[PDB]
Amino acid sequence: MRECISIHVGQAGVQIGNACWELYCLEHGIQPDGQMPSDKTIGGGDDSFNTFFSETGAGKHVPRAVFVDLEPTVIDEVRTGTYRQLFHPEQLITGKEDAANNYARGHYTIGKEIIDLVLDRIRKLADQCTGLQGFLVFHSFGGGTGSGFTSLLMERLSVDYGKKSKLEFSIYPAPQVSTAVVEPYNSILTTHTTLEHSDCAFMVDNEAIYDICRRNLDIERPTYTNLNRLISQIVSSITASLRFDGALNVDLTEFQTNLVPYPRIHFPLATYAPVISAEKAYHEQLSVAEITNACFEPANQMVKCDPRHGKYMACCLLYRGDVVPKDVNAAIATIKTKRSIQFVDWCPTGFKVGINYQPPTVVPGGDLAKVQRAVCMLSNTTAIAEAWARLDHKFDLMYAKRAFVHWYVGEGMEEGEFSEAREDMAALEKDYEEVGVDSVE
Amino acid sequence: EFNSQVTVAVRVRPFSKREKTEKASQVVFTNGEEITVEHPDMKQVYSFIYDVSFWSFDECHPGYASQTTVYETLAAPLLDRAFEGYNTCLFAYGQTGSGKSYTMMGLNEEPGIIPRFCEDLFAQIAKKQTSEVSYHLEMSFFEVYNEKIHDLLVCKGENGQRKQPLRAREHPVSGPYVEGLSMNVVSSYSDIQSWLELGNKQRATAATGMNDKSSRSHSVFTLVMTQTKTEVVEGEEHDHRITSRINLVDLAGSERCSTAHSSGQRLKEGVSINKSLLTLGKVISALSEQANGKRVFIPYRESTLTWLLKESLGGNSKTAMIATVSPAASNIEETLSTLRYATQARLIVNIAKVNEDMNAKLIRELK
Amino acid sequence: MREIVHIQAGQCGNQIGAKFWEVISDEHGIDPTGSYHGDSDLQLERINVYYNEATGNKYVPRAILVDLEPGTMDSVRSGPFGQIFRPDNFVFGQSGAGNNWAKGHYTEGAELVDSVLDVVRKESESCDCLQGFQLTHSLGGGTGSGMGTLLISKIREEYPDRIMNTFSVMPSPKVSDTVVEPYNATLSVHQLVENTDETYCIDNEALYDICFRTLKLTTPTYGDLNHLVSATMSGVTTCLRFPGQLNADLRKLAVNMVPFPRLHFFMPGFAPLTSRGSQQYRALTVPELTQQMFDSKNMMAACDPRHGRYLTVAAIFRGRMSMKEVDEQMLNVQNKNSSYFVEWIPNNVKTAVCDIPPRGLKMSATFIGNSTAIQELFKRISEQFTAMFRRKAFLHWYTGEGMDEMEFTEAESNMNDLVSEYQQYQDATADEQG
């Protein structure tokens, strides 16, 4: 009835999908075989929640998702692992050769002869959907497939489907930590193309979640099976109002509206406050007033950028479980009282609120605890300009000597595409100044 | 610095067929400027002073004011100021069957103010049509009926019901206006006359007990005159323009349901007229108290008429009122309400200005 | 005979109204099947105001449930009183208004509105004589603000001689629940001023104070809040369903509460609300109720009447009250608190008394008040609005759906004129000598 398509691009997106589709099955009562035994006790209804899982007459549940990596390694793990009997075998590998961390390979050259076979599966899924509400794209700046393919895809999806919400969940490069020498380019080339087509780009940064997993969950040697389980929760909160009941339900077009004043600065940040272990689960109250304040604790942000260096233009809080509105209003009133949390002069009503009744589920083998409450924040701040400027300085240090450009030119990229994309990224750094200047009559 | 006062004038009508069948008595006597009402009961006498008085009671008695006289005394100054560069308004007010439509529009062989206005305007234009001054004239003619707006200058299509209503909106500078309104160009008197015929044929009329041709709608005639003139400047000429809006308004009557034997649509439309006059009255009572130091808020949004005429009752226009009264004794209290609202409208003061179309641009700072 | 059509737009109204039928049915003796299991014979005499008889003395309510999301409608069906509504009266779509007034008015609501008129025209024509309408919506979003205001624009054209009552949850002063509350609350007032006769303004921050300060509730859910709004909704329509000594329809209140056609925004109230402990320590009587009704801390409008003047108020009583005890007490208010009333209305109060009280209270009371302190709510939105519209912050989501900046300026000046219409009256007036 209300259905959302997921697109997982690259190693990152797949390794979050696998984290996501391990959680969506548990909440709704599905085994990895696609079957649903607890339908014995209710007799159908909508527990085969059509937002993610379609259903066949044989009792099997197949998810509405499309994977694509241009490398067979990460997806072949799915066809040979626990979830081989859940996914439609059309899991788009064309990985005779990867993108070599090159936005020129992911966009042009190897991006084609596979970009026309990805639209077919989506168009096949949409024609199974009645109330298609939007897309959810999981990718990463820093690669070729998660930087070029997405740009190439989001252009085409802004033509075939037009005015439908396209929300991204992308891994933003960290200021210090990095796994490649070409993250600045591909992160800069992808914004320039994805800016005029997307609607809200949710950013995450692994340097932050590393610190969260150390300080809070007491994990000093984590890996990517832990990070991607937290990201699995953020999406469950965004999509919870489409599956379970609640008091204030939030459709997808509310994030497109309250958090995006102008069509170019739609770059918010995410949080998940009650990231606690089973031991610290005791000794703590875990109330709304406790969980809401943590979401503004800058050490508990999922992107490394201090909001105390900027100002908030909007903020959306997404509650789950045993939450009462009287506890919410008491909490936002405490934040609007504090002076270390500045708001722009043109947004005195700077809080969107949503509440659900279904608490989060606990994956066995996981790091997170069982809780009756859970919160997800989505904030658009002027602090993000600092991160754009950092990527811009790196771009200039390495483009002035024309380093690594012959790998992009060698894949059909013009030299003027680096000067046109770095000059279009120098406009947005000025836009974030105007939105932070207090008006005067 | 300017405070233009509203020009109030009164017109006494002669006896009607009804007021002659019922041999009603004369109570409204004149001496020139002043108008008095001797009640039949002879318990008190009221008297009022006005800028201008007209006595059409007798076609033979001295002091008989004709169509040409009312024109040359009221409208000709407004034409002079409209050529000067002012906005102008002339609006009628009164009861049912009192001579408002006859005064403004007139009949075929007894023209009112509107045709004479347009004719003298075009005459003065043709007599001042130099290469120094060009003239462009647009007209509109519209109708208020049961709080709905309607365009009079269209040839309606055939249907079971063909009256497409329009909407009123508020432009932040120009003020209230009507969206979807035919503004037709005019070059001479003939097109004006044809459009007037079409509009008076499309207007709403009905037969009621106090006038067989009772207008069931308020009628506004708008003329937008743009005169372009030159000044020897650094480059080409034709760099001054003066715009002027002339609003000629014929309103309906209070229409007591008892006398005006009314049931159904007549009651309905009549009730609408009663709600339009109550609002207008309240706006003329608040504008006459806002010109005496006391601060008051004029309610123009409670009626489309007063909403569109925000700029005329107040604001920026040189405006004039024609109160229409009957001399019979069977309508004393309604005549007196008309005369009291007219004596209060006398106290209104507006701020009229020349529409040079240059303020804030360059010559404002020259000045 | 004085029949009413109820319309419920959004996650708020469909959550309020769903309790409104849990409160009326208990008063008329209807079970969740529609079957009658009551005690008195006065219930069935005027049950036709809200209900219709179906087949076997099963009673189906005249409700209309509208929303742009199926999630709210599933709560009604999978609930206590879900099986009584007409399943052909649940109108819904998908892909909701997105907190956008532009969508519920022009783009999405316009696709679903004619379906809503099909229900309204069938329920009204099936009624002998229509007294008016009743809408429960929340302005602050896009469905209730957009798709509700659009219906009123259309029903007022089809039924211009009937009452259109509205129970609207307004934006709150301190804490927001939607980032674009001002744009949607503003444009709704631009339409409600022109197309309504009674608009009861509700604010959740006040109910949070009622539930905490009076009822001594520490965890008040939305069920409890809407258990208060449904009460006033019942008091206003009590003298049509049960008899009394001095009866009052909807029109008699508005004629006695709306002195000018634009000042039809009221501050409701209910009495007697108390905690479960202090009930055994109180004395139920009119001087104890009138003190709660005229208390500024029992309002739902989030506005202090002591910062203004009551132009006109009303009081609906239910029980075996004494009229001397009623008329004596209302006079005590005006003579004591004469500064909070206007001089050019000598008796600023109306009264009404029903003889059949609420299911478990020997006496109840409902209060309706028109004050100039509603200026404070509109004056706030006008500040938030222009602060955002002067920079054009979120405007491109409203223009992209087929709107213009002029429609944002019209609503600003209208709301600002309504402020001045209330502000002239709030300042004390004085004639020359009088």
Ligand SMILES: CC(=O)O[C@H]1C(=O)[C@@]2(C)[C@H]([C@H](OC(=O)c3ccccc3)[C@]3(O)C[C@H](OC(=O)[C@H](O)[C@@H](NC(=O)c4ccccc4)c4ccccc4)C(C)=C1C3(C)C)[C@]1(OC(C)=O)CO[C@@H]1C[C@@H]2O
């Ligand atoms: C004396 C006793 O045994 O308990 C009382 C009680 O404690 C009080 C406080 C009741 C109680 O009300 C509440 O607890 C409450 C909770 C949240 C929000 C609002 C109220 C009561 O539940 C409410 C109940 O009154 C009613 O049921 C009315 O008929 C009420 N009915 C319903 O609303 C209703 C709701 C769901 C299902 C069935 C009925 C009503 C109110 C207005 C118009 C018509 C009917 C009564 C006497 C009581 C209890 C039971 C504790 C009060 O009820 C009202 C609003 O009239 C709250 O203040 C009154 C005073 C009562 O004494």
Ligand SMILES: Nc1nc2c(ncn2[C@@H]2O[C@H](COP(=O)(O)OP(=O)(O)OP(=O)(O)O)[C@@H](O)[C@H]2O)c(=O)[nH]1
């Ligand atoms: N959070 C998170 N990030 C990941 C994960 N796997 C890879 N990344 C990030 O992905 C970034 C680089 O992109 P790639 O890993 O090469 O993925 P890709 O999009 O397929 O790029 P190509 O292999 O060149 O096609 C690195 O900086 C990693 O931080 C993961 O499992 N979780």
Ligand SMILES: Nc1nc2c(ncn2[C@@H]2O[C@H](COP(=O)(O)OP(=O)(O)O)[C@@H](O)[C@H]2O)c(=O)[nH]1
């Ligand atoms: N009193 C009350 N108000 C509510 C409730 N649910 C939502 N609201 C209000 O309604 C507004 C949300 O608008 P809504 O109609 O739900 O948006 P929509 O889903 O897009 O139509 C918020 O400002 C809330 O204050 C409720 O159960 N009770």
Ligand SMILES: Nc1ncnc2c1ncn2[C@@H]1O[C@H](COP(=O)(O)OP(=O)(O)O)[C@@H](O)[C@H]1O
């Ligand atoms: N000065 C006058 N001389 C001759 N007849 C007049 C005069 N004034 C009014 N009448 C007559 O009285 C009637 C006036 O009706 P009208 O003015 O149209 O009513 P209303 O003013 O209510 O629209 C006309 O039939 C007209 O012939």
Ligand SMILES: [Mg+2]
């Ligand atoms: Mg890879």
Ligand SMILES: [Mg+2]
């Ligand atoms: Mg006439």
